[PDB]
Amino acid sequence: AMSLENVAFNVVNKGHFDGQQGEVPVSIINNTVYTKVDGVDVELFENKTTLPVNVAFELWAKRNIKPVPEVKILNNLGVDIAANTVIWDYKRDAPAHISTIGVCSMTDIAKKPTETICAPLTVFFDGRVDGQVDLFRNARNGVLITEGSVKGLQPSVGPKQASLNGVTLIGEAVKTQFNYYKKVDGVVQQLPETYFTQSRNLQEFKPRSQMEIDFLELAMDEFIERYKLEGYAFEHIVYGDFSHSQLGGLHLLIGLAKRFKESPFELEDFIPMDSTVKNYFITDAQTGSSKCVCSVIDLLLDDFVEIIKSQDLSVVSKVVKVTIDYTEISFMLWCKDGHVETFYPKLQ
Amino acid sequence: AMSLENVAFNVVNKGHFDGQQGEVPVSIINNTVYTKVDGVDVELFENKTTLPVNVAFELWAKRNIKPVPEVKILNNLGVDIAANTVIWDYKRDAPAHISTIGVCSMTDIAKKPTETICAPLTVFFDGRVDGQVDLFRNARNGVLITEGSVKGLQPSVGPKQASLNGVTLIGEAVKTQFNYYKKVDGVVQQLPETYFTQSRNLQEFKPRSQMEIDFLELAMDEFIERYKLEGYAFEHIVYGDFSHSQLGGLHLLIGLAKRFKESPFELEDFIPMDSTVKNYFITDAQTGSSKCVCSVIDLLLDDFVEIIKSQDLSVVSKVVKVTIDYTEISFMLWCKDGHVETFYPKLQ
Amino acid sequence: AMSLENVAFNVVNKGHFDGQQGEVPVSIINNTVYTKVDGVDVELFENKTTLPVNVAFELWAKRNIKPVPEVKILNNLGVDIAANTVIWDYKRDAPAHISTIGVCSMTDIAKKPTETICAPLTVFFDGRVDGQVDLFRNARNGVLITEGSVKGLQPSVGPKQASLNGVTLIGEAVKTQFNYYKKVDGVVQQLPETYFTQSRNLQEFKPRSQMEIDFLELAMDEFIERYKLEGYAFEHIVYGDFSHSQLGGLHLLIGLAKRFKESPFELEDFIPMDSTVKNYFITDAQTGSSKCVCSVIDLLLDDFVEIIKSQDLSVVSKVVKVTIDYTEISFMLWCKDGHVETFYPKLQ
Amino acid sequence: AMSLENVAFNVVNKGHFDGQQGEVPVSIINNTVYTKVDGVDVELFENKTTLPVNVAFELWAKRNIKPVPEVKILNNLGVDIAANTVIWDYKRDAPAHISTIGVCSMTDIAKKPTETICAPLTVFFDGRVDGQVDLFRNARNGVLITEGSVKGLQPSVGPKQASLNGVTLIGEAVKTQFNYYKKVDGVVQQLPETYFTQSRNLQEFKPRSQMEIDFLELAMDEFIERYKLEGYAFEHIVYGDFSHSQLGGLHLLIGLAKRFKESPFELEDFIPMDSTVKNYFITDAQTGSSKCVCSVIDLLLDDFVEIIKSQDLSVVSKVVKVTIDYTEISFMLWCKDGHVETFYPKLQ
Amino acid sequence: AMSLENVAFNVVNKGHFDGQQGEVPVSIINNTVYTKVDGVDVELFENKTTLPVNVAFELWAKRNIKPVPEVKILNNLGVDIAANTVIWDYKRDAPAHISTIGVCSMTDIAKKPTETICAPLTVFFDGRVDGQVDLFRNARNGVLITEGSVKGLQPSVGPKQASLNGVTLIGEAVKTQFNYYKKVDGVVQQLPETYFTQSRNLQEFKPRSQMEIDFLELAMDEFIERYKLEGYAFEHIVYGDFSHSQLGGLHLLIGLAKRFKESPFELEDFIPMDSTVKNYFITDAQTGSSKCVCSVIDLLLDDFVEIIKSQDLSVVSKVVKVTIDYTEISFMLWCKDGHVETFYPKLQ
Ligand SMILES: CNC(=O)Nc1ccccc1F
Ligand SMILES: CNC(=O)Nc1ccccc1F
């Protein structure tokens, strides 16, 4: 017997939906769910989704509370739907997927991923849940994560980090590095070799390699010398040119991180969703240099150096395809006389 | 085990709350309750109250569906709250009372009227429900209806009509005429002699006496002649004077019914609620005669005639008090040279 | 080049979406679309659906304005979606189907019904639109209407009436009687023999047979005599029994039409949607007789007589199944000593 | 002459309601109050309450702007209502009490606490306001605060801290330590001996005893030695065990404070109201250790040490009742071989 | 062809409105605009204005993204409207002006500032845009900014700082110091000599003169000695008196900044708009000293010292008019025996 009042009972007593039995009285007004405590209304949930408030509330309450892949990964792998859980998109305060399977009666298209409506959809499977590996094997389309080996299935090692209740972390008391597997049209698919973005914040940025410690700590010319980067235009691409009204380059998070220690800036996240490459409308507070569409990626600097050094530098412009978070990221590479002018995530 | 979804199940399957087990999926968007029937949303309920939508939905579902006293009677008797039912106020599309007893967890102030919070409240008790005559005996404050005698109480015989799911009617297959009993601070009251308003509609007005039949058939002058009404200002009070910009008189529903057969008019119900006297801002379409605050009452014409013939006509202006629907209705009586000038429910 | 403002232009200038170029200024406040005409705002559209206001506005604008099958027929045939039109459900003030094909960018699951997401969906195809009979041939699942023969398909002749901009009618200047054809998993179905409900209103009820004329004119006893209906419980089933608190019988629209000429009653439509059988919570004003869940169907009286005379009357109670509007309507038949006691659409 | 526009006049000119006379024009849209400044709308108030926006606005404007007891205290003492002021709950952005006395015409149940409706309610009285001590003496139920001595009334010394416009502080230019007194059913009640929670934030945590300076500054084993805490499981209870997927212990705010210097964590406040014991759904960012329902209290460490040391350690499990903020807080005490396994606020 | 979907296309692809062609599907619900990315809704804009959501969205998208005068300046100069751009008020999340010219069809009063409706309005002109200087010359009323010299027009040097996408900054890669000119009734007006407020935050405060470095760094008595301020009551006016329940003085931002390093405090911005003098309801966290209406201005300390030293100190009270941000700010000057008691922005 699922119900609004039972969902709120679990939220109040168990911090989330926990299969417990019971009911608390609830009031819904506009987009907010409340419950009486000591005779007054206490807010339990503000619906920021495009779903009816009582539906969003239940989905939220039923969010997966184990570490799960970050939404950008699931998106990059073409996931449409999850088997019998909810991947909550903490960046959008909303379900990451439109529909559900076996979760909620207003949004379910199916009780079980074996139902024929699920066969064209890429269904997300969690091998930490009993039976879900088997259900991947039987599904026409899907993405499977496991903590270990699945007999016969060639694994792809995913990122180190996963999301636990909206916190992106590398697990220590829990495991966040998964094997990933994918199936299209009944056929297991080979996951490409790939880099992974690092998912760091600008407020909390911590380097993760001696090279990155050097970038944060050394002056620009020292660092460029020490890692033999002459002619690669990190002055522009990574350090950022703030001298003109249009802010130049500045496409690596670590570069933003360096600048942020010195002076603040505004990042307007005008498409606020999780993705491998982010676009910001950036305004530098110190200089007033700015740019409407500044693509930023958080690659380990080591990885970005390896990508740019591996490039042929003998054409004016070309599109360079790099596989990142399993998706194929296009960059624009502009050169002159065998040195880099600029290299940036291509704006689409 | 009360729940939004169970209430909706009862509505969908039983036309109203009926204590049945079950659940349907529900969605709430702003003030409307919908349910999914075969993949599309069907409107179950639009909240017109000042309560949270899911709360109003449940009180509406749990409305009393037996003939019950009209809200105007309950209010005139000082009823605060009903015992274990909801008197639905179809004139306000809202619960007639703030709080409930033993009905709904969000609005209940008690489960049983015997709890101490109910003692100072005038509680409504329905003798047709097992045990409620008893509970009225224990109750410090209350109003009781019954269909027949109660041993040791003198009854007050109420109106002929009652409200069945919002239709006011004189029951032929069900009883609508109740015995009334009232208790203030543990003492059974002697209810006053009272007239009753008749609760008719302007559109479907039906005479209930030979005098009313004659009023509808005859011409003004004939009717006034037959019933010896010269000098009582019915021309003004009951027929209505449409010759000036201020619509004159027209304070008796039968007079509005008579005019509405010939030519129509606008009645603006600017305090929409059930009350013994109604105030309308009335605009006569044929003539443009209008009045901002036109008090209207539906008295049996014979009872109105009795009231007006029972007054002293020798002072220019005074307040005349008349018990109606158990409440004291003040009238203004204006006279000149021993005849009536006007007589109207006071606009105080 | 679809846009809010272009849709509004079409509404304002063409009464509906018509593919015209142009733009008017629009403003959206909560669920209402307005447009500026000479400096003030005029209401174009109030959203009563569960879709976003601008989305519902566009689907409403793009409604099919040719006579189309009533929604109850489409649902009974299992239609999921329409090919390149919107069947507007005037009973719910909402789109009849969740999704669209080739109509609206927010709701389209495809541009053409031939895309693979449509193959498992039962698609509605209108033979009056060039190419759609063809598309029905390629379609794995579908329902097709036409005005005339289709070479190589046996037709099923549908109802006389269809819905034109929300008015159900039997077309005299346009055709409303369609041939129906259905395909499940690539196989043309043989549609069952079926009766059709007549889709009449209680207010403007018009007899469509000499028996129905007689039913309206004659007294109960005469009519029952003329048509040899003794022992079939029409007194209860069709005339309705208003003598007890439970309103008895009254399951056939013509019986409600007959009563409504004499005295009025409340029909509460608590699941407002188009369906072959309707459930009303009905309160008779003259008598106070009432019933929470009164199933009503509008069958030609002759067809109802044929159904009831085609049953075995020898068991106390059983389920009688009758194809109507192409769907299986269960009835309860109650008999005693070889005569009918009652017979009603099952309240399951 | 109270009015929306007068309330807004005071807000604009006096920062809050100040009995001043005057009016500014106001516009209300959805849940927000605005006023024109220099021809544009400036937001004055966003209603986060379940009250009508214009009502919440007035209550907010009339909030008590003297230091007042924190809402958890008033709750723990059973306060239902305040005499002639509003205790604004800054943590819920809402009135702490449902109704008022002498404040606001939509929410008043009474103009004065002597009215008989107030007698069953525990009314909050402020002896800094003239007459309110006397009104406590006459009230059947109440809680009284004073700055000094009340002849005959045995005092209870309240917490050091009070809330001033939502800032919890120990007063220096103002007095925040009150005498508390309580009355149930006409009878002064003896307030229990009690500890008080410290009301500290995790961002702003300052130790308040040499012991607490030691906890923050020393390593875990040093501190446990220096205060002879071997066998008392502060390793678990206070320091927190982050080694397993379920975060172990961690029920004292100061322990959260220590960890927060090292690494951040997420505290989901899923019942956001003021209370003596808080429940969080906690996710540790460094380790990914987490717990759905982690009870946290902010006792001075000295006080928590005194509580746990005073316990008999010779049973496996028992419920230990401790009086905190005047309410009786249950703890679970789990022991083995005369040492503490775990000791935590009992989850209800 | 302007449209909701075209505006959203520009927002998504260009970070703001950029004249580009194209459309994305959009959904509007309540006050929020969304668009599909990867099958789910992503929030593009939350309407905090009193305009219809789709109108506010377009105005926002069309905001001027060059450095522009801070709204307080435009207000102080009497600007009603901007020529062919939108000055977005980032402090109110709303257009700074009610109407537009040549921007948006719901809010435009004119396509061009030469239209006769614009002649009484003070129109804001931007000489960085071609033709706009000329349009100032022809306008009956206006305010013009330029980066350089305009032949014949006597300039006023504006503030050093301007606002770029809501960041107030002194330009280095861009120019933020403008010449200002004003016209009333066809006649160029002489802008007064004036100080300028510094527009600093309390979190980010940086001194801007050796004097201000001294104020932040030195003790109170040192600083007062070093700059010969004895008898000028900076102890009160600038340092702030926290000893009594009413917080004394404290009207210079730098004084708040000093205190904030030591201890925090609450500033309730109860009229949140940009202005030259701000009013806060201030609560000091350390002492609980507070004040409902504390006027604060951010003058360079040098400038404030120069203002107060220039005053005659020989009257008890007088109104002192100082021109700041071009508007005439009244101060109250209270003296005794030729020393300053208090000096503060006059409360109106
Ligand atoms: C306090 N007295 C009282 O209630 N009396 C009574 C009530 C109901 C029926 C008959 C009775 F006598
Ligand atoms: C799969 N078969 C099929 O569709 N057949 C057919 C369809 C429409 C008209 C005539 C036909 F023969």
Author numbering:
A (entry chain A), B (entry chain B), C (entry chain B), D (entry chain A), E (entry chain A): -1 to 346
Article sentences:
The NSP15 endoribonuclease enzyme, known as NendoU, is highly conserved and plays a critical role in the ability of the virus to evade the immune system. NendoU is a three-domain 34 kDa protein that was demonstrated to form a barrel-shaped hexamer in solution by the assembly of two trimers. The oligomerization is mostly driven by the contacts of the N-terminal (ND) and the middle (MD) domains, while the C-terminal domain (CD) carries the canonical catalytic residues from the endonuclease family. In terms of substrate specificity, NendoU of the coronaviruses is described to cleave a great variety of single- and double-stranded RNAs in an Mn2+-dependent reaction, by hydrolyzing the 3′ end of pyrimidines, with a strong preference for uracil, and to release 2′,3′-cyclic phosphate and 5′-hydroxyl ends as products.
For the fragment screening campaign, the chosen crystal system was obtained in a citrate condition and hexagonal space group P63, containing two NSP15 monomers in the asymmetric unit arranged in a dihedral symmetry, which can be symmetrically expanded to reveal the full hexameric form of NendoU inside the crystal lattice. Another possible allosteric site for the development of new inhibitors is that identified in the third cluster (cluster 3), which is also a conserved region located at the bottom of the MD, where we found a cavity containing fragments Z2697514548, Z1424343998, Z425449682 and CSC000178569, forming different contacts with residues Arg135 and Lys191. The structure of NendoU in complex with dsRNA reveals that the positive charges of Arg135 and Lys191 side chains are key for positioning long nucleic acids into the active sites of NendoU.
